[PDB]
Amino acid sequence: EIGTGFPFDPHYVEVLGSRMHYVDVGPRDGTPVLFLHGNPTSSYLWRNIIPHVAPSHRCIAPDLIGMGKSDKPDLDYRFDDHVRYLDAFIEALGLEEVVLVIHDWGSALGFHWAKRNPERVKGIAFMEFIRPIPTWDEWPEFARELFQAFRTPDVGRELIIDQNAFIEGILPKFVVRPLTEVEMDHYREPFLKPVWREPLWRFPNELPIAGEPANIWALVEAYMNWLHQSPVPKLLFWGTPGVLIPPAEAARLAESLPNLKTVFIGPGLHYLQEDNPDLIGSEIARWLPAL
Ligand SMILES: [Kr]
Ligand SMILES: [Kr]
Ligand SMILES: [Kr]
Ligand SMILES: [Kr]
Ligand SMILES: [Kr]
Ligand SMILES: [Kr]
Ligand SMILES: [Kr]
Ligand SMILES: [Kr]
Ligand SMILES: [Kr]
Ligand SMILES: [Kr]
Ligand SMILES: [Kr]
Ligand SMILES: [Kr]
């Protein structure tokens, strides 16, 4: 029942000397809604959510540099590289004010951009987002040894680069319902060759867990501090048991963040868009008019 197609015409824009791909649908004026994916996905992740929003709002969904249909420049692919390319993507499209719809490393990018551009963010919808994880005990037990191995020298590259563990293992393991072969092939396409998989390994090595790495920890702490003091309208989707945002964390955010609406989506691990896209898309569409 969940759609497997990707019925969006490609759009491309030159960013810092590379081509970046993005979805661009909906009315051409008004406030645009910017959808940001994370690891190891692309705009494909938003395919069943955008159609709920496009009747009323411009929907823009870029593929991060090195991901989806975007180019693959010779970068480190550290978080700062993604910050630079997304910053330049937003300026290249001439976006002024935006609504953010963000997930995983797309949420680190979105929140970090919002903190630096607070007058330009009219609302933030988010789910399974990057926050400072205090201990490995807060990481789900069934994935703890794997993510520690991703962050272990040599071992992590063997798993993610050589064996494609993030696409073949983590992605289907972090969806409650079974992903279909058609969906897996969409997610596999940008990473068929090992030489393309550096972003997939860099991302877990940047996750802020138990204080490390210190630079990302401080950056994420900073935008969470901004979020806790910001009056911007906020919409959180959460599932059970979750991965980055377990129920107790969703509850804590419901108590501490200003101007927050929360929506429980039912069963969900990390890629909540793949378990209940209809609820996520319909609730975003209902929330946008209040902005
Ligand atoms: Kr993930
Ligand atoms: Kr990264
Ligand atoms: Kr981007
Ligand atoms: Kr952003
Ligand atoms: Kr995290
Ligand atoms: Kr976690
Ligand atoms: Kr896993
Ligand atoms: Kr690589
Ligand atoms: Kr994750
Ligand atoms: Kr709680
Ligand atoms: Kr909640
Ligand atoms: Kr709280």
Author numbering: 3 to 293
Original paper wording:
Haloalkane dehalogenases (HLDs; EC 3.8.1.5) are α/β-hydrolases that catalyze the hydrolytic cleavage of the carbon–halogen bond in diverse halogenated aliphatic hydrocarbons via SN2 nucleophilic substitution. Structurally, HLDs consist of a canonical α/β-hydrolase fold, which is composed of a central eight-stranded β-sheet domain surrounded by several α-helices (i.e. αβα sandwich architecture). In all HLDs, the active site is positioned in a hydrophobic pocket buried between the α/β-fold core and the cap domain, and this catalytic center is connected with the bulk solvent via a main tunnel and a slot tunnel. After several iteration cycles, we obtained an 11-point DhaA mutant, hereafter referred to as DhaA115, with outstanding thermostability (Tm = 73.5 °C) and thermophilicity, as demonstrated by a substantial shift in the optimal catalytic temperature (Topt = 65 °C).
Here, we report X-ray structures of DhaA115 at 1.55 Å and 1.6 Å resolutions and their molecular dynamics trajectories, which unravel the intricate network of interactions that reinforce the αβα-sandwich architecture. Unexpectedly, mutations toward bulky aromatic amino acids at the protein surface triggered long-distance (∼27 Å) backbone changes due to cooperative effects. These cooperative interactions produced an unprecedented double-lock system that: (i) induced backbone changes, (ii) closed the molecular gates to the active site, (iii) reduced the volumes of the main and slot access tunnels, and (iv) occluded the active site. Despite these spatial restrictions, experimental tracing of the access tunnels using krypton derivative crystals demonstrates that transport of ligands is still effective. Interestingly, despite the active site occlusion, experimental mapping of the enzyme tunnels by krypton derivatization of the DhaA115 crystals, supported by protein dynamics simulations, showed that ligand molecules can still be transported through the enzyme tunnels. Experimental tracking of the tunnels by krypton-derivatization of DhaA115 crystals, supported by protein simulations, revealed that ligands can still be transported through the tunnels as they can open to a significant extent. We expect that this tunnel opening will be even more pronounced at higher temperatures, which would explain the shift in the temperature optimum to a higher range.
